[PDB]
Design a binder for this molecule. Structure first.
Ligand SMILES: *[C@@H](c1cccnc1)c1ccc2cccnc2c1O
Ligand SMILES: *[C@@H](c1cccnc1)c1ccc2cccnc2c1O
Ligand SMILES: *[C@H](c1cccnc1)c1ccc2cccnc2c1O
Lengths: 114, 117, 118
């Protein structure tokens, strides 16, 4: 799994430990070992949500499996919770795109996971 | 809906009003209220199109529905037009990836848009 | 085809001509003319891979067709090789997401690549 967050929140507002907390919580939530987990945080972005430039975030979670109705609702509660607590972004100004990747379509270490 | 534009055009060349124009024109084009529309503009990028570093853009549009043959061609005319007028990027140096998202695969406000089951 | 690389490697560590090299190599690999290849490299990113901030990369390759089991394995060897040689990123700290795009879902030049039906 890999999680990307793009936000207009300033870099200085991203707390020490944020990437590590995302890694650990995503490990817990997806059931995948933490050595698999990639996280990517992009602050200081030029963004608007609903026409407003108040804090917001556009995110993606890719995973090989473990993507679906109830699972994605659980991920959203977890991830919105973290974005609200750590970056002070309101959950209703967050979008998260979920992608169920086929193993043949994820490259790693000179090959793929197929 | 969310629209992202990544471009090698400098930040200083992005005109006042650009994010708001994108928001408004996308609301009109998709027939969805502007309150739902997210836009993201990323200037000053290291990118090439056809091996040339002349102005170009790589974009994404995500929507739950309202994605398809004729609709996507209309979005391209709209969005290429705006990128040409506002950022002076040639339409033949723009790619836009269109994504028809399933409601169960879009998170928002602690949940997703799949509330039925 | 479009190839995006996001990495925590410094901008200064990206060789001049890297974009051109990626363009040429991708043209050859995909069999598409270079005029249609787009490349995008994003350095200095705040990233972790397996909980570590050692050099890593998260990438995307989009193509209309020419995506598949054997082909993707070939692309991974090629692209991991270039990232290792040019950016000094270990192949086991690279992810590449492959996307087989439908022609109707790729916009270009005021339209899309679905030109056959109305
Ligand atoms: C548009 C959208 C935003 C982010 C990712 N994919 C699509 C969007 C947002 C909210 C909606 C709510 C109800 C119905 N449709 C919606 C969209 O299409
Ligand atoms: C490659 C591409 C570019 C942007 C998004 N997805 C894929 C591409 C570009 C143009 C083409 C024209 C004809 C046939 N195939 C094409 C591609 O694969
Ligand atoms: C994490 C991942 C990263 C990028 C795209 N999709 C998923 C990941 C990595 C390796 C795996 C191997 C087997 C099964 N699942 C995996 C993941 O989810």
């Amino acid at each position: 799994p890999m999680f990307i967050v793009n936000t207009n929140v300033p870099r200085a507002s991203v707390p020490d430990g944020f990437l590590s907390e995302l890694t650990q919580q995503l490990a817990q939530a997806t059931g995948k070992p933490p050595q698999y987990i990639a996280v990517h945080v992009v602050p200081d972005q030029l963004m608007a949500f609903g026409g407003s430039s108040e804090p917001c975030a556009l995110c993606s979670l890719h995973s090989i499996g473990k993507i679906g109705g109830a699972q994605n609702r659980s991920y959203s509660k977890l991830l919105c919770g973290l974005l609200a607590e750590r970056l002070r972004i309101s959950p209703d100004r967050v979008y998260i795109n979920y992608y169920d990747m086929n193993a043949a379509n994820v490259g790693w270490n000179n090959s793929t996971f197929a």
